[PDB]
Design a protein around this ligand. Structure first.
Ligand SMILES: O=C(O)CCCC[C@@H]1SC[C@@H]2NC(=O)N[C@@H]21
Ligand SMILES: O=C(O)CCCC[C@@H]1SC[C@@H]2NC(=O)N[C@@H]21
Ligand SMILES: O=C(O)CCCC[C@@H]1SC[C@@H]2NC(=O)N[C@@H]21
Ligand SMILES: O=C(O)CCCC[C@@H]1SC[C@@H]2NC(=O)N[C@@H]21
Lengths: 118, 120, 118, 120
């Protein structure tokens, strides 16, 4: 359900596997920002959701270091999986950059991504 | 280092290991909310931070299901580690509950947690 | 440009006037939550924006008290106006409810609204 | 009350008047960022809060244009006032810069400011 390949509105690629233990594992390729190639992602999802037409709560993290570049930053996406034939993961995110203490007030960006399954 | 046992301003306990190449693995025990006992967490951190005085970017996720309870929700914390005599993890977090599509506008709480290794 | 009537994806109605001094004034009618009828809004916008294809920064607040109900809560929308023939105000928001100190960790909801001019 | 002169943890000065029926009117002087001197602010607050111990919901906006500078940005603070011997305004804020549509994903900073009437 969650497992598979997804793209968001920015053109980024999310490849994820949902494990029976509630683990999310995969890779993220961002189409924008201080990024190239694939980054490891790890996260968690509700592996026994409500069956009431509620989405499945999940989240994951990328630290923007790979063996090609390092942006000294990390994003977390928090959201829910909405199943069916046109599956979606609807998220909000927090992108924190490492900063000096004096600059910490401007460390974190916030946004929202919608992911479509392919 | 990041590895260790941390406490936030609500009294919740964050036990984590920082793997050499960027993993965060541990458990989270919340002192408030629809939760008891420990929950699995996973995340990532910058395993080669800048050497200019900046903190270490990191984040992690908890889905609030364990053998005791299931709140049908997940929190992600996004922040940075600040080393020093009084090491600190400063975060902002997003707590998404599963909801119907309709109620999705009120699905996500936002807040901020600071962590230190000082037991309450 | 900004002045006029707007609706968002939830079906809420935003009626605003942009003053020459950078003031935003108007009324908000929410289609969801603990709300009925029109609420006062006040806000600010950049009254001398960049002319570079950058949007116009703005924000506004509603306290969810009117002479019909009171939700003991307030939303702020922060975002930018994107002009032209299909004008949009793209926003993120923070909805804080009054809470006891022990409950303050769960005081604030976050989301995002897109407004279309009519 | 909410009316008065407030300072946050960055040292920025928030001078506000709470109108009887819900207005917030004042000035904001930021101690960090692309700003100097005072900026106009406006907002709203709950003029009949609950009587159970809860805080007073409020919010306000600053667009960062004044006679000295224009950062082409706006911040909104959303929070609540907590009365008591050490009154406090606890907020979360969103700072949106104008950007092209393309760069809109990195247009908005989020943070948290606490305010008290204690001068730094
Ligand atoms: O610039 C950085 O520090 C690293 C890349 C950040 C890319 C961000 S993560 C949130 C948003 N969603 C995407 O697919 N890309 C951006
Ligand atoms: O209530 C739930 O849905 C699960 C528990 C949520 C606890 C939240 S996570 C953010 C904040 N930080 C904490 O230590 N606890 C709360
Ligand atoms: O429930 C409340 O406390 C008052 C109504 C809140 C309505 C919210 S404000 C953010 C979002 N955008 C809308 O048009 N409605 C909701
Ligand atoms: O840099 C800008 O675009 C304008 C100044 C921003 C100052 C920010 S607003 C949030 C935070 N709280 C403060 O008192 N200052 C910063």
């Amino acid at each position: 359900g969650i497992t598979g390949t997804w793209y968001n509105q920015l053109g980024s690629t999310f490849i994820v596997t949902a494990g029976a233990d509630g683990a999310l594992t995969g890779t993220y390729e961002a189409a924008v920002g201080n990024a190239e190639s694939r980054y490891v992602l790890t996260g968690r999802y509700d592996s026994a959701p409500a069956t009431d037409g509620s989405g499945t709560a999940l989240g994951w993290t990328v630290a923007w270091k790979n063996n090609y570049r390092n942006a000294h930053s990390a994003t977390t996406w928090s959201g829910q999986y909405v199943g069916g034939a046109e599956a979606r993961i609807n998220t909000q995110w927090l992108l924190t950059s490492g900063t000096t203490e004096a600059n910490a007030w401007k460390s974190t960006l916030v946004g929202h991504d919608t992911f479509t399954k392919v």
